[PDB]
Amino acid sequence: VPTKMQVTAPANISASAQTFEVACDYNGAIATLSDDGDMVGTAIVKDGKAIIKLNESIADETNLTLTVVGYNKVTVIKDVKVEGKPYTVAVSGKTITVESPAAGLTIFDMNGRRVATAKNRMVFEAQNGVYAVRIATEGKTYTEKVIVK
């Protein structure tokens, strides 16, 4: 029968984060952040903590799952909120056009850095790579992920 381990982690993570710290009383447990499969970073617990280095930007996510697994331990799972229909996000060559009347718009580069903020509409002049767009309306934030060639 497996035993329990203690796990403490934040309930929220910045859209711009590069790391996520997990405390755990079982050294050698593995703590992983994921979006429905897509594993976005993993670290082993050493000296009571795992410092997860993200392997990609999570700015295109509104939630992530934290899972901590240990040998003969009960797995621990926690939901983590990521914080930065009625919109469009358009790509044309190196431009990204975002439109959503009354909404806060933000774009993040592939390192998670916030590169643009505007209300209602913006055209962003991008470079080759992958961007996240977050569209914050009253009640709800939507996201899209954009490839610029």
Residue numbers in the entry: 579 to 662, 672 to 736
Direct quotes from the study:
However, diffraction quality crystals were obtained using mutants of the same construct, which included an inserted hexahistidine after residues S664 or I665 (recombinant products r664i6H and r665i6H, respectively), or by substitution of six consecutive linker residues (I665ADVAN670) with a factor Xa cleavage motif (IEGRAA; r665sXa). The three structures were solved and refined with diffraction data to 1.9 Å, 2.4 Å, and 2.1 Å resolution, respectively. Each variant of rIgSF-CTD formed nearly identical crystal structures (RMSD of 0.760 Å for r665i6H and 0.327 Å for r665sXa, with respect to r664i6H for 298 aligned residues). Thus, we performed our analysis with the structure refined to highest resolution (r664i6H). In each tandem, the IgSF and CTD domains showed an orthogonal arrangement, with their longest axes tilted by 90 degrees with respect to each other. Regions with defined electron density included the residues V579-G662 (IgSF) and K672–K736 (CTD). The 9-residue linker (T663-D671) between the immunoglobulin-like subdomain and the CTD did not yield visible electron density, indicating that this fragment was disordered in the crystals. The hexahistidine tag was inserted in this disordered area. The overall fold of the rCTD distantly resembles that of the IgSF domain, and both domains superimpose with an RMSD of 2.11 Å for 63 aligned residues, despite sharing a sequence identity below 20%.
